[PDB]
Design a protein around this ligand. Structure first.
Ligand SMILES: Nc1ncnc2c1ncn2[C@@H]1O[C@H](COP(=O)(O)OP(=O)(O)O)[C@@H](O)[C@H]1O
Ligand SMILES: Nc1ncnc2c1ncn2[C@@H]1O[C@H](COP(=O)(O)OP(=O)(O)O)[C@@H](O)[C@H]1O
Ligand SMILES: COCc1c(CO)cnc(C)c1O
Ligand SMILES: COCc1c(CO)cnc(C)c1O
Ligand SMILES: [Ca+2]
Ligand SMILES: [Ca+2]
Ligand SMILES: [Ca+2]
Ligand SMILES: [Ca+2]
Ligand SMILES: [Ca+2]
Ligand SMILES: [Ca+2]
Ligand SMILES: [Ca+2]
Ligand SMILES: [Cl-]
Lengths: 294, 290
């Protein structure tokens, strides 16, 4: 059951995409089968970024290898992150559907598809325009979505500025056909607030909580968060899984600042210290409270 | 300090190349910077292999980004494994030379280049043809080489069948310019229940040699070399090379036994006993030869 197909970026330097997601999932006892959508020198925050990008043909080629070897029924979980390719984003829906069919033919429980719609952050799109719409279409097929507040804003067309606006953005996701939505953080300038929204019933259960806001811009935080969320949600209800994943991020951001990745440090300095405290990836030193809304 | 550039394969399914190497090195506290020479569905033993292979331009393009962002002096270790491309094998020499330069300019400890000359196993050359000659050239620049007995044999032209012949093959690597050689295992006609390893350390022109055995476990495994070289880089960071070989051998013995108790089934269970990757249940004896 602890087998994930993870479709995200690969970077040589630093910690984003599959490099960031893989180590935490492995520590939690998951086999991570990674399809690397790009193979780049580093994340898009650096003045230079070089390397290879998948086209649709490269993606369907990997899929043929997985299909022919009868590996598709293995994937209890599908996790998508950085793709930044309209054709490959569109193709994920067929990939997930083909996995669901292979699992049913093997008498396995249905897969769970976690979609992190990786498009941008700090108010800037760092992925192409056509990709926004392809994510709206893919999200109709996702079980869980983990947008940052920028992505939630551009998908729903609702400016996520507060709890109320986060809820309207999350209701859009549910109407779209995504049952479970985490808006991972949004605007007490010393804390960030998050929303978990679960639509069955036609009813929606909603939860909130807060985490300390650390001064500085981090990269890879969403990627570690979604990987952590898959790992905890395998054996926790989603509210607890969110709280534990928030706790993991707090430990990792604090370790990064301690090793000298403050607000004013270099991009290299601010790379998440994903490997520094492996025990704290499985067992965070705090678990954020995730409290029902009325 | 604990920063490795790892030039090996990526596979979606299973545990070879950077999939065998990365999790152990991360558990030991190393940042692993991976260049994925291929991105394939699975290792070469399955009925179907699909995926992307780098060309030279793809490799030198990645290098361009690493150079441009000033990352090259970070690499205290360079670890190469599966490449299976003559042009990239030859390019590694320039990549190491540029890292050596960047670290010397910055007054850092000399980089250590661990070359695993990945070409074949089980008597079969699963990699291309003139890759062999390219590895003989690259090995002129290696600090540590970790061939299997097949690779040691094809590179040196000595059939490695015992300790005498392992020493002849190692001596070839020393003459080519690699000071430190691990021939990871060979069978012995005269000792069928054991695999023997050799560690050979050329200095004065003197050579210190060490040997020992592990049990010869039934069956055929993949990823064993890749986890061995990664573990060796990890242990050799703080341990003398003899004790480092001993611990790496112990790690592999725990993994093979953990694989035996659990092709899809004979994949190395690399992530199943994270404790055993750092602190193996036992270390192999690695004893000096007189
Ligand atoms: N500056 C920060 N201070 C505190 N927590 C943060 C900070 N940046 C990120 N996080 C944590 O990382 C998680 C994911 O980060 P977020 O910015 O929401 O996603 P992304 O990295 O995808 O843009 C948040 O839910 C929060 O727990
Ligand atoms: N059948 C086996 N029994 C015991 N140890 C083995 C066996 N196969 C591999 N090993 C271990 O794994 C290490 C690397 O395997 P080896 O076969 O020498 O290289 P490769 O996997 O590159 O061919 C060996 O040094 C040894 O510790
Ligand atoms: C700022 O970098 C964005 C980014 C992310 C997600 O944070 C993931 N992969 C790659 C390749 C990226 O460039
Ligand atoms: C077992 O197949 C051999 C192999 C290895 C070395 O184990 C490494 N990478 C790839 C891509 C391989 O196919
Ligand atoms: Ca963010
Ligand atoms: Ca739906
Ligand atoms: Ca960010
Ligand atoms: Ca993100
Ligand atoms: Ca072998
Ligand atoms: Ca083998
Ligand atoms: Ca090998
Ligand atoms: Cl012998």
């Amino acid at each position: 059951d602890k087998h994930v197909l993870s479709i995200q970026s690969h970077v040589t330097h630093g910690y984003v995409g599959n490099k960031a997601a893989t180590f935490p999932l492995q520590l939690h006892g998951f086999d991570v089968d990674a399809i690397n959508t790009v193979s780049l020198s580093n994340h898009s925050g650096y003045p230079v970024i070089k390397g290879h990008r998948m086209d649709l043909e490269e993606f369907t080629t990997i899929m043929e290898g997985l299909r022919a070897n009868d590996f598709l029924s293995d994937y209890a979980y599908v996790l998508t992150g950085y793709i930044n390719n309209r054709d490959i984003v569109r193709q994920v829906a067929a990939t997930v559907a083909e996995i669901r069919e292979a699992r049913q033919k093997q008498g396995k429980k249905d897969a769970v598809f976690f979609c992190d719609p990786v498009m941008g952050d700090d108010g800037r799109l760092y992925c192409k325009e056509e990709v926004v719409e392809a994510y709206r279409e893919l999200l109709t097929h996702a079980d869980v979505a983990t947008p940052n507040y920028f992505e939630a804003s551009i998908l729903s067309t609702v400016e996520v500025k507060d709890l109320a606006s986060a809820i309207e953005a999350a209701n859009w996701f549910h109407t779209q056909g995504t049952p479970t939505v985490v808006i991972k953080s949004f605007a007490d300038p010393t804390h960030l607030r998050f929303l978990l929204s679960c639509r069955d019933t036609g009813s929606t259960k909603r939860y909130t909580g807060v985490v300390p806001y650390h001064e500085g811009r981090y990269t890879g935080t969403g990627d570690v968060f979604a990987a952590s969320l898959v790992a905890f949600a395998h054996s926790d209800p989603m509210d607890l899984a969110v709280g534990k994943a928030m706790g993991v991020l707090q430990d990792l951001i604090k370790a990064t600042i301690e090793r000298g990745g403050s607000g004013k440090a270099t991009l290299s300095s601010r790379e998440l210290r994903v490997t520094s405290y492996p025990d704290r990836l499985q067992h965070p030193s705090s678990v954020a409270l995730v409290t029902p809304l009325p």
